[PDB]
Ligand binder design. Structure first.
Ligand SMILES: [Zn+2]
Ligand SMILES: [Zn+2]
Ligand SMILES: [Zn+2]
Lengths: 1131, 48, 44, 66
RNA sequence: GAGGGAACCCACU
């Protein structure tokens, strides 16, 4: 039976709860890593060619079968142990699993049979393991087993541990491969250009890009040329077709123009035929191609081989790379030329770069596969060099000594540790920030960082189009969550039900198409192409079909029952262009949609009833997918579907605005991401305020993880009393915000009281703050280790002695124990030693290199942990705890972009009060509201008053007609309050009623990480830089502030020349030099002996003292190093 | 190159040493000039 | 001095330059004792 | 993490009410009736118990170092 | 009574 509209909200949140019970939130990272480990590593090992080596004896090395173990640790003893993630985090280990491989070495001598050596399970490096993946040791463990291992069961996984640091792989956007995209290059010689970044499927190789372009009108006619890989000049397209093996113009035009009764395509291909008439043979065309190669060979036959290698191996690898597969390549190149002509005629629209179905998302799988492909090539190269050396002069080589496991191990470790995605010696020419340190300030920040997408377009670009919120981002990318500043629009976040496809083999779909009446390209005359539908499988034109509608019906029926076609395969029928494109590759972002047949949902009450007992029936989300009820639609397929926003669009009368709905949104509020789903009433706010809250929800202090006592993070922040919001969204039930909340429901009165809340400020209740309101804990970890940097050098944790250690920092050392480490529970201040480390000097046999506490960061040593690092030295980590009571200048934000620092704190007797004696916890200014139009803040406050009076958690799902401001007002008036949330407040100071009535009620506030005590900084005089002798950088180094160029301009406009001289000369770097009065060069001055001598002039009396900045002296000496003579003349 | 001119040496090795000296002096002054490889520290980072 | 083993909850005497290993279970992560010094908290 | 001793706004004792509130909720009370039975009349005291997340129970599932 | 630089990333106004 059909789901009634009164049960629809409950049913749709049931199916959403089923989806998040199965998939979770970091499914894309785990799925990509599992595909990389299970399939991509073995495929990379296979596609690597066997090593053939001759001096002579012949040696053939063939890598056959990989073996991956579980993550094990080997200490200096050498006994393996099951290495746990907390052990990796605490001991600064890399959570990696050893990768073995089966190698076969065959020996081919002269007059001797082949000899087989089976080197089974040969260790070739260590693969870092994503947490909670298949090969992690936490896989399949219950929550009790995770708690017994000191792991948080709410922790999502999806990250790596590299040297004890948690690293997340940000997903990387790229243009889709194997797809023809025609653009119009502006201000160039090309009117239009077709582009195909061709990459061969089932393999990890770089993408070869071909440009089939057309020259501009400004030339008798406009001609089509081809820019091929490894070819320096542009080649006319008819020459490429002739070199492919088709000399006649009729065959080339049959490959290009499918309907010969179309004269304008003939008119536009006329100039290319006229240009390339002088070549008429395949070998002459191959000669013309090879004449413009990377290195043109002197032998014509060498040019023929090079041109054939370019046209076969490097021209469109996806349609075919083997021998005698040139007709498929010719049909694809003709299709590219046909698309170019269609764009030239205006008969087909130009492709959109920002269209997000033209983009793929490289997740951890593809990125790690690219790395491992390069490094396995490097490992085979080094094995080849070693075995070549020991077959050249010697006769035999040991294979276990040939393999350098440091290559794979340290390359993966380096690229995951630094984020530079490439090689260590080529860091400047590799993409950076692919791997980032995982944000652990809030659980919401952890989730948002684990579901983070990145456009690798430079942030210095001032064009707006990649930063714009495209239409095709609906349901795939959160429209609110983007950073502010240089990375706006470029860094994106996943929507909650968005899933990035993991990849599949096209072989079942290809076989099914072969015997479902699709005729191949090799077996058809071109005359049949004009009326038939071209079929593309992963961008490979494989054939044509005469009945495309029943073919798409059959394909959808197969995918909906999880037959031959798997669920993540995208199938798009371009009906107007007569094309069917089937995509199975990875990186396609999709989302599940309810299937609608004849204005009725296929989701019935039986599915909802079965899902209500998910843990009884064993009915899950995957059963709902297999039932043909929901299906995953990606961005390219979504451009052909007809979405009902709600089932109310289906059950509509005579003018439903559409009678051909194909899909229905499960819930529209699922278009938001993790951080935008905690906003209550987001559709009542201005959109930049939702963006600002999506930014600040990652800076909100709560309880970031459950096992924070085990962890020693460098920066950690724990609220005393985090509360779940009184006004929640239903999407917050799957972000675990009810279990790890970040904030407190606060009685907020929006009023102007004493003027101390003006310009985005809040007044806090000091009496509330005394009771623990928004009190937090700051944890800081300090790491130190003994290191044997040489035989004589020996750092050691010792309690130092004043008459024995060189160069102490005049501090106390009594709080250290005699192991050199401070004890837990000891109060520490900014000038205190917490780790006493001395290094032996090669009577002061050792000097002080003790670890000091960061200045002005008073606190108490919470924990001290002693362990062994990777290379077996003593390693200490000390967590110091400091209690942060809310202060004037601490940043606080509601969930609506209402950031603001605390301006003052009043006690309970000074704050305004209601007739019940309720004082606000926070008073905010009214003027924060009108220009912002954060009406969702007011509705959250009203709904929270209703929720706290009724004893319930208010629902603030965005698009909900059951919740209305009038309904909340009537509910509030039912509880003895004014219906609009106003109350009569009395002045705290005088007791008189405030003439206006104050809006007051519970609103969820967040304590942001930005305390004033982490930012207050003054310098009188102190440390200076070595080179320019100017003050240092930042409060952490007791540095000075920069009196920059704009400040210099402002003080010029003020006319204050002596203040300008004070700031830029004698508050930064005074210096005195002695210059010759004749040559103007700095002289040699001995101030002790009064010997002022100038070499180059024989001058010992015409020397003058000049006061200049030290940076100006350094500038003049640098100029003299550049053979410039800056001569300071005192006349 | 002092060694290669104090004792006898070929013209081409002297020209190659002159080329290397010219490259080193130019990259001491200007390390971001186009057309030539950048002078790099052994860690792979270029020199300043 | 006395370090608690992270896994087996037992206290162990460790001298200087002794490798940090639990004599019971061979666990390499160990924690210092809470100090005996007298620390006063205002109850605020 | 644990129930606050005082209501933040007014300072009424709510630290002795969390287990009683959980027992009332286990006894099929609604949340509003459970709050009314405990004498929490002001909504400032009601947000103490209504919005409390008792994280200390899940913290007690970890084996203690000390 | 004060001994590194560089690179990259995140964030703030
Ligand atoms: Zn002179
Ligand atoms: Zn132990
Ligand atoms: Zn109260």
């Amino acid at each position: 039976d059909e789901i009634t509209p009164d049960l629809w909200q409950e049913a749709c949140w049931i199916v959403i709860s089923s989806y998040f019970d199965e998939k979770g939130l970091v499914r894309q990272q785990l799925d990509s890593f599992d595909e990389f480990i299970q399939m991509s590593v073995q495929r990379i090992v296979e596609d690597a060619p066997p090593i053939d080596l001759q001096a002579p004896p012949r040696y053939l090395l063939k890598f056959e079968q990989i073996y991956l173990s579980k993550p094990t640790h080997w200490e200096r003893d050498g006994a393996p142990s099951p290495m746990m993630p907390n052990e990796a985090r605490l001991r600064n280990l890399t959570y990696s699993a050893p990768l073995y491989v089966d190698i076969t070495k065959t020996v081919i001598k002269e007059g001797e049979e082949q000899l087989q050596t089976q080197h089974q399970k040969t260790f070739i490096g260590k693969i870092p393991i994503m947490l909670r993946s298949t090969y992690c040791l936490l896989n399949g463990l219950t929550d009790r087993d995770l708690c017994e291992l000191n792991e948080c069961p709410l922790d999502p996984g999806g990250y790596f541990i590299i040297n004890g640091s948690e690293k997340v792989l940000i997903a990387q956007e790229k243009m889709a491969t194997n797809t023809v995209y025609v653009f119009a290059k502006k201000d160039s010689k090309y009117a239009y250009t077709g582009e195909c970044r061709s990459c061969l499927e089932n393999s990890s190789r770089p993408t070869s890009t071909i440009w089939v372009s057309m020259l501009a009108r400004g030339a008798i006619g406009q001609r089509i040329v081809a820019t091929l890989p490894y070819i320096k000049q542009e080649v006319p397209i008819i020459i490429v077709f002739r070199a492919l093996g088709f000399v006649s113009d009729r065959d080339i035009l049959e490959h290009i123009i499918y309907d010969f009764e179309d004269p304008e395509m003939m008119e536009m291909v006329k100039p290319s035929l006229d240009e390339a008439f002088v070549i008429q043979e395949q070998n002459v065309a191959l000669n013309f191609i090879g004449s413009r190669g990377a290195k043109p060979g002197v032998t014509k036959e060498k040019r023929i081989k090079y041109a054939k290698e370019v046209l076969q191996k490097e021209m469109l690898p996806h349609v075919g790379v083997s021998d005698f597969c040139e007709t498929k390549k010719a049909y694809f190149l003709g299709y590219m030329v046909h698309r170019l002509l269609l764009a030239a005629l205006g008969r087909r629209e130009l492709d959109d770069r920002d269209h997000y179905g033209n983009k793929r998302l490289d997740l951890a799988g593809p990125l790690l596969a690219f790395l491992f492909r390069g490094m396995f090539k490097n490992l085979l190269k080094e094995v080849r060099i070693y075995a070549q050396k020991f077959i050249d002069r010697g006769k035999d080589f040991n294979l276990e000594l040939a393999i350098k496991t440091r290559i794979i191990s340290d390359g993966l470790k380096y690229s995951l540790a630094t984020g530079n995605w490439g090689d260590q010696k080529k860091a400047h020419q590799a993409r950076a920030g692919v791997s980032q340190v995982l944000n652990r300030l809030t659980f919401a920040s952890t989730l948002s960082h684990l579901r983070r997408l990145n456009s690798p377009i430079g942030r210095d670009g001032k064009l707006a189009k990649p930063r714009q919120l495209h239409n095709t981002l609906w349901g795939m990318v959160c429209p609110a969550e983007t950073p502010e500043g240089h990375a706006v629009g470029l860094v994106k976040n996943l929507a909650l039900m968005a899933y990035i496809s993991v990849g599949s083999q096209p072989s079942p779909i290809l076989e099914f198409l072969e015997e479902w009446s699709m005729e191949n390209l090799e077996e058809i005359s071109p005359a049949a192409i004009a009326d038939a539908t071209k079929i593309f499988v992963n961008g490979c034109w494989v054939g044509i079909h005469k009945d495309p509608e029943q073919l798409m019906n059959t394909l959808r029926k197969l995918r909906r029952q999880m037959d031959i076609i798997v669920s993540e395969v995208s199938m798009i029928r371009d009906i107007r262009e007569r094309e069917i494109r089937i995509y199975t590759d990875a990186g396609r972002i999709c989302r599940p949609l309810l299937i609608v047949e004849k204005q009725k949902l296929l989701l019935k009450k039986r599915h909802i009833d079965q899902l209500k007992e998910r843990e009884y029936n064993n009915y899950s989300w995957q059963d709902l997918v297999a039932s043909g009820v929901v299906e995953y639609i990606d961005t390219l397929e979504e451009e052909t579907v007809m979405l009902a926003m709600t089932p109310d669009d289906l059950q509509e009368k005579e003018v439903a605005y559409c009678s051909t709905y194909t899909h229905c949104e499960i819930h529209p509020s699922m278009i938001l991401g993790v951080c935008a789903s905690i906003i209550p009433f987001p559709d009542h706010n201005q959109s930049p305020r939702n963006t600002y809250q999506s930014a600040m929800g990652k800076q909100a202090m709560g309880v970031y993880i459950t096992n924070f006592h085990v962890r020693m993070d460098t920066l950690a922040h724990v609220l005393y009393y985090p509360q779940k919001p009184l006004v929640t969204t239903r999407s917050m039930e799957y972000l675990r915000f009810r279990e790890l909340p970040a904030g407190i429901n606060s009685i907020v009165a929006i009023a102007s009281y004493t003027g101390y809340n003006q310009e985005d400020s809040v007044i806090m209740n000091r009496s509330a703050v005394d009771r623990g309101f928004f009190r937090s804990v700051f944890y800081r970890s300090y790491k130190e280790q003994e290191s044997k940097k040489g035989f004589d050098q020996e750092e050691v944790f010792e309690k130092p002695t004043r008459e024995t250690c060189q160069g102490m920092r005049h501090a106390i050392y009594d709080k250290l124990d005699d192991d050199g480490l401070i004890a837990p529970g000891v109060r520490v201040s900014g000038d205190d030693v917490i780790i006493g480390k001395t290094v032996t000097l090669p009577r002061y046999t050792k000097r002080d290199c003790s670890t000091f506490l960061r200045t002005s960061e008073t606190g108490i040593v919470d924990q001290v942990m002693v362990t062994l690092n990777q290379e077996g030295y003593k390693f200490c980590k000390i967590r110091v705890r400091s209690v942060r009571i809310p202060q004037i200048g601490d940043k606080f934000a509601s969930r609506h972009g209402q950031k603001g620092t605390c301006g003052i704190q009043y006690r309970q007797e000074d704050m305004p009060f209601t007739c019940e004696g309720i004082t606000p916890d926070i008073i905010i200014n009214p003027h924060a509201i009108p220009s912002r139009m954060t009406i969702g803040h007011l509705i959250e406050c009203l709904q929270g008053k209703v929720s706290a009076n009724k004893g319930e958690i208010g629902d603030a799902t965005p698009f909900n007609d059951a919740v209305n401001v009038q309904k909340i007002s009537n509910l509030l008036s039912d509880y003895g309050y004014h219906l609009r949330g106003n109350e009569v407040l009395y002045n705290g100071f005088t007791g008189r009623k405030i003439t206006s009535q104050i809006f007051i009620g519970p609103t969820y506030y967040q304590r942001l990480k930005h305390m004033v005590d982490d930012k207050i900084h003054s310098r009188a005089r102190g440390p200076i830089q070595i080179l320019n002798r100017q003050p240092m950088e930042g409060r952490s180094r007791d540095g000075g502030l920069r009196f920059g160029e704009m400040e210099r301009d402002c003080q010029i406009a003020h006319g204050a020349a002596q203040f300008l001289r004070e700031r830029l000369f004698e508050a930064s770097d005074p210096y005195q030099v002695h210059v010759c009065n004749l040559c103007g060069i700095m002289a040699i001055a001995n101030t002790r002996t009064h010997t002022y001598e100038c070499r180059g002039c024989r001058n010992k009396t015409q020397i003058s003292l000049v006061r200049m900045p030290y940076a100006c002296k350094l500038l003049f000496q640098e100029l003299m190093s550049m053979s410039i003579a800056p001569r300071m003349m005192s006349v | 190159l002092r060694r290669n001119e104090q004792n006898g040496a070929a013209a081409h090795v002297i020209a190659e040493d002159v080329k290397l000296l010219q490259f080193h002096v130019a990259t001491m002054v200007d390390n971001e000039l186009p057309g030539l490889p950048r002078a790099m520290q052994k860690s792979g980072r270029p020199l300043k | 001095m006395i370090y608690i083993c992270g896994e087996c909850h037992t206290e162990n005497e460790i001298k200087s330059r002794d490798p940090i290993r639990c004599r019971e279970c061979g666990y390499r992560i160990m924690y210092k004792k809470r100090t005996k010094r007298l620390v006063v908290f205002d109850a605020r | 993490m644990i129930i606050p001793v005082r209501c933040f706004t007014c300072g009424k004792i709510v630290g002795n009410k969390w287990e009683a509130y959980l027992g009332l909720l286990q006894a099929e009370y609604t949340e509003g009736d459970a709050l009314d039975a405990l004498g929490l009349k002001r909504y400032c005291c009601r947000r103490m118990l209504l919005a409390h997340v008792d994280l200390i129970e899940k913290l007690l599932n970890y084996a203690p170092l000390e």
